[PDB]
Design a protein around this ligand. Sequence first.
Ligand SMILES: [Zn+2]
Ligand SMILES: [Zn+2]
Ligand SMILES: [Zn+2]
Lengths: 180, 180, 180
Amino acid sequence: SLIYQIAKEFDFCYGHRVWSQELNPDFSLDPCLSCRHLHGHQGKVIVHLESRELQRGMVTDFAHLNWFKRFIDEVLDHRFIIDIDDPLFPTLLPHFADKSALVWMEEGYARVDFERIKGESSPILELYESFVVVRFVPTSESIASWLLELLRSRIQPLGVKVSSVEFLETPKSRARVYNE
Amino acid sequence: SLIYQIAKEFDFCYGHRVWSQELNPDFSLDPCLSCRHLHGHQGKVIVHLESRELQRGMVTDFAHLNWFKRFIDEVLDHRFIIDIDDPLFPTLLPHFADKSALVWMEEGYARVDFERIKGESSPILELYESFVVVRFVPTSESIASWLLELLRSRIQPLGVKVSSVEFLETPKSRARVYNE
Amino acid sequence: SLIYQIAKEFDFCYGHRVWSQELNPDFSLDPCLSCRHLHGHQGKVIVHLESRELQRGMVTDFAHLNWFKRFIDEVLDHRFIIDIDDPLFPTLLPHFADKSALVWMEEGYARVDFERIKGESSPILELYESFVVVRFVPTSESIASWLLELLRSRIQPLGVKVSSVEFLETPKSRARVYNE
Ligand SMILES: [Zn+2]
Ligand SMILES: [Zn+2]
Ligand SMILES: [Zn+2]
């Protein structure tokens, strides 16, 4: 049986930190918890779709992931991705410490309610425009699992399967989650 | 148990069009059928070969794909790949509108019979030297499947399996066909 | 079911030769056994690790291969890799022509015992500091197999599996060994 796959890459830049990172120094050599620092990455998502047959020579058209490109562009690019359980949440989002005025979207992330910060200065608005709040520690593996969940929920009308999602955190390191 | 694989890349440039392209505008956002345009690509073929044991430390020598290199270089590079059943076939190859005087090669493509255009102008000859005629819409997935068939039928005397072939249409998007 | 993987790349430069290379000319086209020449490469090791669950959002931390990066950097980079059974071993290492006075390490390579050439000229010392002696023909498949072995033997206390190792001989060609 032949299996047919297609894969597309989507790029974006973001900041995050991995607040729970723990290391075994026998393996890391240096015990410093550097992923607990505020930092950032150039991310690449690679979506793999699969069929057991071709329709008009295709698994499905590459342009059929255009809505997802739009999601990556409009929601994640040039943003800071923060775990709602991050202990620095009330420190970095002090106008939203009690976690009450967050607006959860269907895709599973939150933006702050900007109504609550009306009449704050421009730099303060820029700050809060930055945050994409998620309910998971934003590791490459976590992000990849979340994007796999989103794709799965939405791709079914195309008649193909999402077989895996890769998330490259740097050009030399990446995560992959397979949908078996 | 271990499985051993080798993979090798082969590059070429070509023109084509995907004449049958259709889009679901809910997923693509734009309904424009841009792949129906005459265009081109830098293509990359990746061949994956597999064995369950190493012979002399190898799956098989990388150079044992040289004949396949020659094929890509001599047949596909700097050519325009066209489906025999593209509706524009008669328009782009008017001297061969009946599709009879084509010379089909063992690998499953054709060139025009140049006897029938003998004495045509130099530019007309250069036009007909361009075409590689195939029996499929030349999508990334169809190209990958075709080259997989070609490799499966030839590599037997090497004692190795072809496990899959990848075809990169752009650095951002690619197809893979798995033999199994 | 979901399966989680991470992969990380490690780069190094080295010299070797494949003393035992043979070719079938129906496939290589050219019979010349060029891999038997002394030469070298830019190598890339890609380590894939797998787990059936995430812990703190991770398969395991990318930094848990820092010991492996050190091994690559300190043992393999800017070295010449030679099989102890290369017919040229006595010619290239004439002060260790009997192939004893080698110091084998747990990772499965040897360096010469420098006590034996104490007192020799500086250029002679430089020559011998170059060699990494191994018990296989140093093909890409063999290097990958060996690195896989080292990784499996070390990674067990982290509770993840080494699923495969890729070893890139050139940008265009690579080996992969899967741990099935
Ligand atoms: Zn990070
Ligand atoms: Zn195209
Ligand atoms: Zn070599």
